[PDB]
Design an enzyme around this catalytic site. Structure first.
Site, PDB file in Angstrom:
ATOM      1  CB  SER A 113      -0.930   0.006   1.196  1.00 59.01           C
ATOM      2  OG  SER A 113      -1.755  -1.137   1.140  1.00 59.01           O
ATOM      3  N   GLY A 116       2.318   3.797   3.280  1.00 61.55           N
ATOM      4  CA  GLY A 116       2.244   3.280   4.631  1.00 61.55           C
ATOM      5  C   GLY A 116       3.641   3.218   5.198  1.00 61.55           C
ATOM      6  CB  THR A 118       4.569  -2.380   7.350  1.00 63.18           C
ATOM      7  OG1 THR A 118       4.823  -2.209   8.746  1.00 63.18           O
ATOM      8  CG2 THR A 118       4.953  -3.786   6.970  1.00 63.18           C
ATOM      9  CD  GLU A 227       1.871 -14.187 -23.248  1.00 62.36           C
ATOM     10  OE1 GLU A 227       0.819 -13.590 -23.567  1.00 62.36           O
ATOM     11  OE2 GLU A 227       2.488 -14.962 -24.015  1.00 62.36           O
TER      12      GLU A 227
END
Ligand SMILES: CC(=O)O[C@H]1C(=O)[C@@]2(C)[C@H]([C@H](OC(=O)c3ccccc3)[C@]3(O)C[C@H](OC(=O)[C@H](O)[C@@H](NC(=O)c4ccccc4)c4ccccc4)C(C)=C1C3(C)C)[C@]1(OC(C)=O)CO[C@@H]1C[C@@H]2O
Ligand SMILES: Nc1nc2c(ncn2[C@@H]2O[C@H](COP(=O)(O)OP(=O)(O)OP(=O)(O)O)[C@@H](O)[C@H]2O)c(=O)[nH]1
Ligand SMILES: Nc1nc2c(ncn2[C@@H]2O[C@H](COP(=O)(O)OP(=O)(O)O)[C@@H](O)[C@H]2O)c(=O)[nH]1
Ligand SMILES: [Mg+2]
Lengths: 412, 316, 426
Positions: A113, A116, A118, A227
């Site tokens: 995320s 943040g 961590t 791909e």
């Protein structure tokens, strides 16, 4: 063949529990079946504990659940350097212990995320330590970058201008799903002013299922992870495409469900349905990977797309003749038994690189300056093993990401 | 106002055979070009620039002000093998090879003696280090945690710091040498100057005009700055990590203070560090300050030199 | 993670009884009993405030510091008073004189070592320590002086773990003491330079908020205390619960302090409706932000409307939409762009627990770092000078081994502290 996944940060873990849910759900493997193929990292125990207390409790090995009882800290520095460091070894160990057990893998789908402690910091060095230990693979990181106006942390940008610069030179393809721009979808394309985080998660939890799950699953037009990066990144910058889903209709309200291809594909390019506040305000697409699933006739596609290629108001880059990777799967989507997702018999999870993010990055960079311009919460990082360097020198970094995403487009 | 001065040293034998190429390109006498981006400063001294030429431009005016009763500060910054030792002290007794400090001390004692007619001089020296956010006296090993206090007029001062009376240039050098032997440094194998703390040397020039009854007290602060440490690299832990954070915090504070002074801000954040509060009286008002930044011209040092260059840019 | 509460002085102590009165119930811990917890979640994280010995006796890990026996002997002789292990009681039967100097240099300085002793026994308890909670009043001896020392020592022993400080800054209108600004100015000084999170409460900001926001006609102290303790529970303990988006002391700290002073906040609770009637339930959410962000309802004395904000932390704790939360916060940030400072694109720090205050459906603690609190240290600082100038009751300080330069120091310091804070209001 496989693709490990490292869900980092409470969020990346919540989203993880979600994407991980949708999985078994469409593979007939109840609470206690086989064995996952990922790990969970966080410097705040109580959250990974939720995976240790709540649902999908015994579907994991207390070994692929890493925690640092210590402190999270909504600050990059601490999570990357100072604290986050202590855990990394151990973390890696699993992505080296889980990476061995398999058979010729393809990469690690990382879940973090951006803004943040961590999630930004830590990963920064996790992906960092990966690009060196397995440079010979795919590093597709699935991020949830900063809501355009509805951010949370006060510092957010500090943490996101820092996770971008450190991961940039390490990722293969970075998928992006905007937390806010997903709410719109929950308000405008599903109707609900009661969207729990547990929902946005069900959503990405969907778009993601279209990436790995089903794709790594046989079909009429298979698309490997490699791909992607190949058909999706024009340039080494760990380029960040955007995730979009088509049948995002409500399983209660309206019901026109039977919305033949010709429709669901057009519903991808309208900006109000792309899990990202990067409305194609000008950003010329430069490559899209239309992953379809369910009952779809290749001609239907090799036509529905043709119609698009000639809408012009959808202007694709110059140096790009054709930038449409048509990925066809068989098995239709699989909606939560009773969440709020319609449940159609065909969907389009189209992701792409759009000169659009020229914006999103811009608007997020500017943020940063304003605060840095006054050092704001700087003392919080410095005192955590960082310097005027890492900031100023990671700012300059993105600067050439504002020029990059500008040059590769807008010009012929 | 504040002035920033950059100094490039010549290449040494240990890096001549390393095959490094000169990344340092110069412009005018104030700009240095590294990787096609310019870097403007008050003055840039190449390698041919003498110790005499360096001193005159960076310290000579501050010395005159201190002898006139005003305050002044000289900061010296640079990574290991940048040229701090050579610039600030050099060959301490040699007339040509001597750095900045023996010259300041030369000029001070050349003003002294030359005024013996109605004037009575007292030269008081102080030497302390800031290590792990503690003020340690380098002249008294028992005083390991000195505190910054304010007098009735809110002027911050270091309470109980040793104040040694010095009557000659040699006495000052001996005091610097004694203090250096008390500084927190690590046992490193090949190199003279590597520290884990910031150093502050105080030269207080006191004068009493016996007939006029008027007194002056000018303060010269000689600050030795430990280089910024990227803790991710080095892999510092425990006390070393506490040292690195403390050095980094102090340099941020200092950068915040000089930036505020440069922009002419009403609020100057002296309270950001114990260092900026010790230097508050000598940094504020009618006081000239010079930041001397030393870097290398090696292609390998391009990272740490651009780090030293950006710190100087912060001051402006 | 963990923390170790600290009940400095009588007030800080009296409140201890209320902070623990609450918190316990918010953790199903009866007097000496164990975890009766209506649920099973009010236990997986308790550690933060207790210790395992018997198996039904989870004892609060706080410290009770005071130079007046009668006090702790009222807290220990009443309700929950018999849950603290006696070892916790660090008393000073001396004369708990109302002098900052008497509890910081002469009388308290002795009792200190016998405190630090325990503050270490508790810190070295187990697992990993986060920080210490500190309650007290900046208008007395055992509070401002001795408690302000306890920290200056704590912050030398673990400059790593955090330090939240709950101070009862001297209420304006009427001062419940006389030297108040003396004991105060002197303690704020120590605060601005040790603890790194301070939550300033005002006995009269409470009355108001307790007599008009709770038609409560007879707001006894117990109440005020109770209201306060309600906020400090939302802060800490709370975040040590799960949440879609949870934070913890640090997040709170690392998102709220732009500049090292330490800065002081002003806590505000959410559902603050009178009992019967008012029980409007208008708590969908816009109702909570409506609340929290109004002038009145800020436990502080000053009014936010009188100065920008640097940071804000709506620490909600009750099932809600990360959308109707993340959203509201915005309009709020735009309807009042005026006061919310600009060099911070997103001042607000949205936090979101899950389980709410035991008996309630939805709440949200507010921790504001507004520049408005400038207009309080001003107050205090004024009162000082007006009386310092004449050295009013100064002989009670000096005569206790103090300095005429000590008072100078503090005022200035804390006085400068006012200055700085304005540097952002502009
Ligand atoms: C039948 C019913 O629903 O009663 C409610 C009630 O009527 C109201 C009025 C409560 C009531 O609170 C007060 O009257 C009050 C008294 C002194 C100081 C401050 C407040 C209540 O007493 C308080 C009590 O609060 C709790 O249970 C929380 O868990 C709270 N607990 C305590 O403060 C506590 C009190 C005594 C012993 C131990 C703990 C809490 C809040 C934040 C963090 C941790 C705990 C609640 C909901 C009620 C009553 C019982 C009437 C209200 O307060 C709180 C803190 O919830 C006052 O406005 C709110 C709105 C509530 O609806
Ligand atoms: N889609 C989605 N976004 C989430 C979820 N949980 C959190 N987020 C978003 O991710 C960010 C929150 O990160 P945090 O939960 O604060 O932190 P973390 O990344 O887990 O790591 P720490 O800071 O150390 O706790 C915010 O921008 C949230 O809006 C979730 O379940 N789904
Ligand atoms: N909220 C609140 N304030 C208190 C309590 N007790 C004393 N006070 C306040 O504290 C100040 C007096 O200091 P006091 O606590 O007696 O000092 P000490 O006991 O000598 O450390 C006054 O401003 C009171 O209003 C209390 O139980 N609650
Ligand atoms: Mg988390």
């Amino acid at each position: 063949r496989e693709c490990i996944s490292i869900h980092v940060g409470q969020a990346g873990v919540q989203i993880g529990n979600a994407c991980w849910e949708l999985y078994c759900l469409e593979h007939g493997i109840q609470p206690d079946g086989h064995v996952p193929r990922a790990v969970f990292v966080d410097l705040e125990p109580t959250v990974i504990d939720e995976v240790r207390t709540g649902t999908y409790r015994q579907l994991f090995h207390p070994e692929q659940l890493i925690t640092g009882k210590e402190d999270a800290a909504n600050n990059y520095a601490r999570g990357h350097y100072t604290i986050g460091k202590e855990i990394i070894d151990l973390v890696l160990d699993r992505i080296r212990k889980l990476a061995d057990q398999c058979t010729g893998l393809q990469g690690f789908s990382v879940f973090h995320s951006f803004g943040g402690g961590t999630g930004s910091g830590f990963t920064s060095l996790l992906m960092e330590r990966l690009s060196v230990d397995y440079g010979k693979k795919s590093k597709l990181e699935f991020s949830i970058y900063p809501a355009p106006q509805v951010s949370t942390a006060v510092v957010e940008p500090y943490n996101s201008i820092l996770t971008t610069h450190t991961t940039l030179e390490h990722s293969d393809c970075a998928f992006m799903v905007d937390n806010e721009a997903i709410y719109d979808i929950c308000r405008r394309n599903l109707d609900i002013e009661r969207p729990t985080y547990t929902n946005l998660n069900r959503l990405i939890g969907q778009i993601v299922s279209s990436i790995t799950a089903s794709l790594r699953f046989d079909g009429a037009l298979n698309v490997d992870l490699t791909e992607f990066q190949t058909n999706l990144v024009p340039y080494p910058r760990g380029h960040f495409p955007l995730a979009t889903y088509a049948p995002v209709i409500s399983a209660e309200k309206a019901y026109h469900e039977q919305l033949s291809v010709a429709e669901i594909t057009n519903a991808c390019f309208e900006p109000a349905n792309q899990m990202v506040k990067c409305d194609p305000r000008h950003g010329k697409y430069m490559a899209c990977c239309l992953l379809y699933r369910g009952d779809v006739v290749p001609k239907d596609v090799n036509a529905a797309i043709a119609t698009i290629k000639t809408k012009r108001t959808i202007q694709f880059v110059d140096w790009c003749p054709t930038g449409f990777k048509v990925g066809i799967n068989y098995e239709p989507p699989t909606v939560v038994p009773g969440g709020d997702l319609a449940k159609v018999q065909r969907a389009v999870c189209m992701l792409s690189n759009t000169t659009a993010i020229a914006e999103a990055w811009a608007r997020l960079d500017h943020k940063f300056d304003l605060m840095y311009a006054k050092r704001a919460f700087v003392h919080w990082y410095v005192g955590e093993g960082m310097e005027e360097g890492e900031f100023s020198e990671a700012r300059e970094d993105m600067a050439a990401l504002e020029k990059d995403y500008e040059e590769v487009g807008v010009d012929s | 106002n504040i002035k920033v001065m950059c100094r490039f040293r010549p290449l040494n034998e240990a890096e001549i055979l390393r095959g490094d190429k000169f990344i340092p390109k110069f412009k005018g006498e104030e700009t240095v070009v590294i990787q096609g981006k310019p870097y403007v400063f008050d003055r840039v001294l190449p390698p041919n620039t003498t110790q005499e030429q360096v001193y005159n431009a960076c310290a000579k005016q501050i010395v005159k002000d201190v002898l006139e009763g005003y305050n002044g500060t000289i900061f010296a910054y640079g990574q290991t093998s940048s040229g701090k030792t050579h610039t600030m002290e050099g060959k301490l007794h040699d007339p040509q090879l001597m750095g900045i400090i023996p010259r300041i001390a030369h000029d001070i004692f050349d003003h002294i003696y030359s005024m013996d007619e109605n004037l009575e001089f007292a030269i008081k020296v102080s030497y302390f280090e800031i290590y792990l956010d503690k003020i340690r006296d380098l002249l008294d090993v028992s005083k390991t945690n000195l505190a910054v206090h304010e007098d009735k007029n809110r002027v911050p001062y270091v309470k109980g710091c040793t104040e040694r009376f010095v009557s000659s240039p040699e006495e000052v050098m001996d005091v610097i040498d004694e203090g250096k032997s008390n500084r927190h440094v690590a046992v490193t194998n090949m190199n003279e100057h590597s520290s884990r703390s910031h150093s502050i040397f105080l030269i207080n020039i006191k004068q009493e005009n016996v007939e006029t009854e008027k007194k002056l007290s000018g303060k010269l602060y000689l600050v030795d700055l430990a280089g910024s440490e990227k803790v991710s690299k080095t892999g510092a832990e425990g006390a070393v990590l506490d040292e690195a954070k403390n050095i980094n915090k102090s340099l941020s504070a200092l950068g915040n203070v000089i930036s505020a002074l440069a922009e002419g801000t009403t609020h100057v954040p002296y309270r950001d560090s114990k260092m900026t509060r010790i230097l508050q009286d000598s940094l504020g008002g009618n006081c000239r300050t010079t930041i001397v930044i030393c870097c290398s011209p090696s292609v390998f040092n391009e990272a740490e030199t651009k780090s030293t260059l950006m710190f100087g840019q912060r001051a402006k | 993670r963990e923390i170790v509460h600290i009940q400095a002085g009588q007030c800080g102590n009296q409140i201890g009884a209320k902070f623990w009165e609450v918190i316990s119930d918010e953790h199903g811990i009866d007097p000496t009993g164990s975890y009766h917890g209506d649920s099973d979640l009010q236990l997986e994280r308790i550690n933060v405030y207790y210790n395992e010995a018997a198996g039904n006796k989870y004892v609060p890990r706080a410290i009770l510091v005071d130079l007046e026996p009668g006090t702790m002997d009222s807290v220990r002789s009443g309700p929950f008073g018999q849950i603290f292990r006696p070892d916790n009681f660090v008393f000073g039967q001396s004369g708990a004189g109302n002098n900052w100097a008497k509890g910081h240099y002469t009388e308290g300085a002795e009792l200190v070592d016998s405190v630090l002793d325990v503050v270490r026994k508790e810190s070295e308890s187990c697992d990993c320590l986060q920080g210490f909670q500190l309650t007290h009043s900046l208008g007395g001896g055992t509070g401002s002086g001795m408690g302000t020392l306890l920290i200056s020592k704590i912050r030398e022993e673990y400059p790593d773990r955090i330090m939240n400080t709950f101070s009862v800054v001297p209420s304006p209108k009427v001062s419940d003491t006389v030297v108040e600004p003396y004991n105060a100015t002197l303690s704020v000084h120590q605060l601005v330079e040790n603890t790194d999170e301070t939550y300033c409460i005002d006995n009269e900001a409470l009355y108001d908020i307790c007599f008009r926001t709770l038609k409560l006609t007879t707001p006894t102290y117990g109440d005020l205390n109770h209201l306060v303790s309600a906020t400090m529970s939302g802060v800490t303990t709370c975040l040590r619960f799960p949440g879609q988006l949870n934070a913890d002391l640090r997040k709170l700290a690392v998102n709220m302090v732009p500049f090292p002073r330490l800065h002081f906040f002003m806590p505000g609770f959410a559902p603050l409706t009178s009992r019967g009637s008012q029980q409007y339930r208008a708590l969908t959410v816009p109702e909570l932000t409506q609340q929290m962000f109004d002038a009145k309802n800020m436990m502080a004395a000053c009014d936010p409307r009188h100065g920008r904000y640097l940071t804000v932390a709506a620490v909600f704790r009750g099932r809600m939409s990360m959308k109707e939360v993340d959203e509201q916060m915005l309009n709020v940030q735009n309807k009042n762009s005026s006061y919310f400072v600009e060099w911070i694109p997103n001042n607000v720090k949205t936090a979101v627990c899950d389980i709410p205050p035991r008996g309630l459906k939805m709440s949200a603690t507010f921790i504001g770092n507004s520049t408005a609190i400038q207009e309080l240290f001003k107050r205090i600082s004024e009162q000082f000078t007006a009386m310092f100038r004449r050295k009013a009751f100064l002989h009670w300080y000096t005569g206790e081994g103090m300095d005429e330069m000590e008072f100078t120091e503090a005022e200035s310091n804390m006085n400068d502290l006012v200055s700085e804070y304005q540097q952002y209001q502009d």
